[PDB]
Design a protein around this ligand. Structure first.
Ligand SMILES: CCCCNC(=O)[C@H](C)C[C@H](O)[C@@H]1C[C@H](C)CCCCCCCC(=O)N[C@@H](C)C(=O)N1
Length: 377
């Protein structure tokens, strides 16, 4: 019955993917952003210039107040509100209803996005990072505990205004090609994984692999870019710069502060390198790799002015809180969050965006010694 969930995600490029949900009785319809980078379910519950609608507790007969405040800070954006519970369901998801924790957003800062079309957020990670603390059971945990929905979900994010699928409770084989490759969820808080090697156009960056996970490495559908720790970010940009030297860039471009353009249909993709991220595998000394095409880290940005050229923004940015594999990475694949078996699977997506002479891929197996040493402690 997964076909009913295919194509249940929508969104605007760079503004997150959202799924439709209903909260309260009678059911209140809202678009909720899917965030594997957090664990709190929250919805705008008070007027806001960027919100077209919001959760109205006074109109729901099943709403229960928990009489507790809550605040949640993200890499960018934050909100605070009032905790409570209410009945929730997903129209284009499993046919079930569950009572879950809901944070009614009363105040926010740089959280809601103008014209994004979503009014709430669904944190799909674990209770360990839930606010105010791990006692606030996350939505998916509640779903799994109250219903017969298996403990896993998969995300198929399709880039270029964007669409995709969140298959709740299973894997839909019609959405990917080739084999699924699994990497262990290191610890159950963020969906933390371990990167064991990085190559750019087939050349190893040759850094201590701990640097790749310096602090941590997570998979986050709620982050647009591929975010890399300082040292790693610098090595990558240096490499990407050198490979594309035969072109001129505003330099602010490499910081994501300025976009580059080219005459329509003349983008020199061939000069931008593919990036291969090797992830720890399921067996001893075994890993696999996923390769990223420049069409993924060069996010298209429409030019409101003279819509004659194709412009793009560099979607790889520096981080101080570890590596973040955002939409830039996920859009190229079918990603399975197999909580039950504590692993995350990757497979080439059916909606992959491949160029003409190169192909995004998930390949294995590779042999890699001392992978455990790649994890930061
Ligand atoms: C409270 C512990 C968990 C905190 N988790 C996070 O902060 C994760 C890593 C980031 C979240 O996914 C947040 C989720 C944000 C609020 C909402 C999605 C907004 C659409 C994408 C906007 C551009 C973007 O890329 N935002 C990143 C920088 C971001 O902060 N992402």
């Amino acid at each position: 019955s997964f076909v009913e969930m295919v194509d249940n995600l929508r969104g605007k490029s760079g503004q997150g993917y959202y799924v439709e949900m209903t909260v309260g009785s009678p059911p209140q319809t809202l678009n909720i952003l899917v965030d594997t980078g957090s664990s709190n379910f929250a919805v705008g519950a008070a007027p806001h210039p960027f919100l077209h609608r919001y959760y109205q507790r006074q109109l729901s007969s099943t709403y229960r107040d928990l009489r507790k405040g809550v605040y949640v800070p993200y890499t960018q954006g934050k909100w605070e509100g009032e905790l409570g519970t209410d009945l929730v369901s997903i129209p284009h998801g499993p046919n079930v209803t569950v009572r879950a924790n809901i944070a009614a957003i009363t105040e926010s800062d740089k959280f809601f996005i103008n014209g994004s079309n979503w009014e709430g957020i669904l944190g799909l990670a674990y209770a360990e990072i839930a606010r105010p603390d791990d006692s606030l059971e996350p939505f998916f945990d509640s779903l799994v505990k109250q219903t017969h929905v298996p403990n896993l979900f998969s995300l198929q994010l399709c880039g270029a205004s964007v669409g995709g699928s969140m298959i709740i409770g299973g894997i839909d084989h019609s959405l990917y090609t080739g084999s699924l490759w699994y990497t262990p969820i290191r610890r159950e808080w963020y969906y933390e994984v371990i990167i064991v090697r990085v190559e750019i156009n087939g050349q190893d960056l040759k850094m201590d692999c701990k640097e790749y996970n310096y602090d941590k490495s997570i998979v986050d559908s709620g982050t647009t870019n591929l975010r890399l720790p300082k040292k790693v970010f610098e090595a990558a940009v240096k490499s990407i710069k050198a490979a594309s030297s035969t072109e001129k860039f505003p330099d602010g471009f490499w910081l994501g502060e300025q976009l580059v353009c080219w005459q329509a249909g003349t983008t020199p993709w061939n000069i931008f390198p593919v990036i291969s991220l090797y992830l720890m595998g399921e067996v001893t000394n075994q890993s696999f790799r996923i390769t990223i095409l420049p069409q993924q880290y060069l996010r298209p940005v429409e030019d409101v002015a003279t819509s004659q050229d194709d412009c793009y923004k560099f979607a790889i940015s520096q981080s101080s809180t570890g590596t973040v594999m955002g939409a830039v990475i996920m859009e190229g694949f079918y990603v399975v969050f197999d909580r039950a078996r504590k692993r995350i699977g990757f497979a080439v997506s059916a909606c992959h965006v491949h160029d003409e002479f190169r192909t995004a891929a998930v390949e294995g197996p590779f042999v890699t010694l001392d992978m455990e040493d790649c994890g930061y402690n």
